[PDB]
Each structure stands twice: as structure tokens, then as C-alpha cells.
Amino acid sequence: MSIKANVEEILEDIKKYSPYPEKVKLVAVTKYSSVEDIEKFLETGQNICGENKVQVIKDKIEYFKEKNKKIKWHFIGNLQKNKVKYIIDDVDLIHSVNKLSLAQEINKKAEQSSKIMDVLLEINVYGEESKQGYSLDELKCDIIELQNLKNLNIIGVMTMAPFTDDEKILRMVFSELRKIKDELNKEYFNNNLTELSMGMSSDYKIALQEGSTFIRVGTKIFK
């Protein structure tokens, strides 16, 4: 196998399936990858790397600083309020803002470092009882408090579909989050929401067709 060939195939899929290929970013899911394999990914010409554990990304960030490698770090897992301090200075995008208290902690820490953190709002579109994401009603109730957090830059929304082979369910999930983004863009964000984070290795071609701008692909790149 060839990491370069795998990345190349995904970029071709983006051109083939996205309604707007120029907007789509590949997020390599590096949560199970050694720093040697990540380095191999970087050598493809891509450098967006997504992690889901704070301790793991913390140590990988320090490693690649010392190796002087340029990486756009995305945090794509569950973020505990008291762990925000460990990533606030080095992560470029937090995908998983699922509640107001987390957004407020991210805002407070961003302000203390004199920066604006880009975030996505995590939305539980399918309604899973392993819930973490916003329901739509909860988000609507939070919206104005959220828009007043001046050291957050809310640029889009995120969901994770359950694993399934049913293409109809996947399209329903991905299209539902797209509809939410379009609605939020009319009613509250004045079109400032540009990103749709959805799709992983087994379903990203569907997510691309449904308008995904961040596909979080692990196994398809590295295995």
C-alpha cells in the first residue's frame, strides 16, 4: 500500500463527488497513527490532521514543533472543559462544540491567549442516545449567547452518522445537517457558516455528494 496513492484517490473522489470541490478539505484522522506515519501523510502535500484525545494530540503537537513541521491541527473528539487549556494555543479548528458551557470555556481561554478560535457546532442529527451533539432546539436557544462569544469564530456545523450501509439513511443524515446549516445561515449567521464536517472512510463519497467540506478519513488513508 501507498499513503500517497490513497490520498490521491481521495482527492480524485472530491473532484468527482463534491458539488463544490474547491471548498472541500481532507482531515486525516491520525488518532491511531504513529508520528512516522503522520510524517508520511505530510509528505503527500496535505497537512490537516485530526485527533480525538487531548493527551495524544498534546504530545504529537510538541513532537512536530520540535521537528519543525507545519500542520493544521483539528480536534475532532470529545473536549472536556478542563482540558481546553491544553490545546487552545495550537489547534486550528475544534469540530466538537456541543454545548454552551464548552463554548464559553473555549472563548475564555481564547481571550486569555488574545486569539479567536475557529469552531464548528456539533449537532446530533440522528438522535442517538449516546448523545453528545446539540439538538436543534437546544442550539437555537443558545444561539445569541453563542454569537456574543467574541473570541469564538463559529464557521460551520458537524455531525457523526452511525455506521451503516444503508445509503438512504446516510443521505438523510448528511442532507439534514446541510439543511440545518442553510437555515442557521438565513436566520442567525448572515451566511457566515461555510463548513460542513461529516463523512468518514466508509461513507465519505456520500458525504461529499451531500455537500461535505471536511471529510474525516482515517483507515482509507493509512490502512
Side-chain angles (χ1 to χ4, degrees):
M1 57 100 103
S2 163
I3 291 180
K4 176 66 180 181
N6 292 350
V7 166
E8 210 174 74
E9 174 180 345
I10 299 168
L11 301 182
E12 294 162 23
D13 288 338
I14 290 181
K15 239 65 186 61
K16 181 174 178 307
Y17 292 111
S18 180
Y20 36 57
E22 78 280 354
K23 299 181 59 195
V24 181
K25 281 71 72 187
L26 165 67
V27 172
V29 173
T30 52
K31 62 188 186 169
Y32 299 137
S33 296
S34 68
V35 298
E36 284 92 348
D37 287 336
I38 296 181
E39 172 63 31
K40 282 287 193 69
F41 170 68
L42 306 180
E43 293 164 4
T44 64
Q46 300 288 313
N47 72 339
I48 304 167
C49 298
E51 300 268 341
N52 71 338
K53 297 288 178 177
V54 166
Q55 194 54 45
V56 174
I57 195 182
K58 188 190 188 311
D59 292 332
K60 280 162 178 185
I61 287 162
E62 183 53 36
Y63 174 88
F64 285 102
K65 276 182 178 152
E66 297 186 23
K67 306 303 289 279
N68 202 236
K69 300 282 173 190
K70 185 171 172 293
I71 292 152
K72 294 185 172 318
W73 288 110
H74 288 209
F75 195 81
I76 64 174
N78 167 264
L79 186 56
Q80 320 94 284
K81 288 198 299 277
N82 55 42
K83 301 312 181 181
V84 169
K85 56 173 154 285
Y86 297 118
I87 64 163
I88 197 63
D89 293 310
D90 305 289
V91 161
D92 283 356
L93 184 62
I94 294 171
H95 291 227
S96 49
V97 179
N98 60 330
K99 63 190 183 181
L100 179 56
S101 65
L102 178 51
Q104 293 172 326
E105 178 72 9
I106 296 158
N107 183 73
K108 190 227 293 176
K109 306 308 285 174
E111 190 253 311
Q112 299 172 1
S113 316
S114 295
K115 62 183 280 179
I116 310 184
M117 177 72 222
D118 295 350
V119 301
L120 309 182
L121 301 182
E122 170 173 8
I123 301 185
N124 186 354
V125 159
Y126 195 62
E128 303 272 68
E129 300 86 71
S130 282
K131 181 263 306 281
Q132 215 201 253
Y134 268 108
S135 79
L136 182 57
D137 280 345
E138 292 172 341
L139 177 45
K140 282 183 183 153
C141 286
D142 281 4
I143 273 281
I144 286 322
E145 265 95 34
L146 287 172
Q147 282 183 305
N148 291 353
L149 298 175
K150 308 312 286 163
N151 293 264
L152 297 189
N153 182 26
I154 305 166
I155 67 175
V157 295
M158 183 226 77
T159 198
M160 295 167 34
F163 179 86
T164 174
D165 46 55
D166 188 330
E167 171 181 324
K168 186 178 177 325
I169 292 180
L170 292 173
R171 289 197 191 271
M172 180 184 332
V173 167
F174 296 148
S175 86
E176 183 55 41
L177 191 71
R178 194 182 64 255
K179 282 193 274 160
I180 291 171
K181 171 185 173 278
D182 292 351
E183 168 191 354
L184 293 179
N185 258 338
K186 295 189 178 75
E187 307 173 335
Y188 305 101
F189 285 91
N190 300 270
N191 291 292
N192 288 316
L193 297 182
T194 56
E195 306 308 318
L196 267 187
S197 176
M198 42 171 98
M200 11 134 265
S201 286
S202 56
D203 60 18
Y204 71 91
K205 300 171 181 184
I206 308 300
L208 287 169
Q209 286 177 316
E210 297 299 322
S212 179
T213 68
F214 287 116
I215 52 176
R216 301 170 324 245
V217 173
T219 48
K220 179 61 186 291
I221 291 178
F222 291 112
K223 263 73 182 183

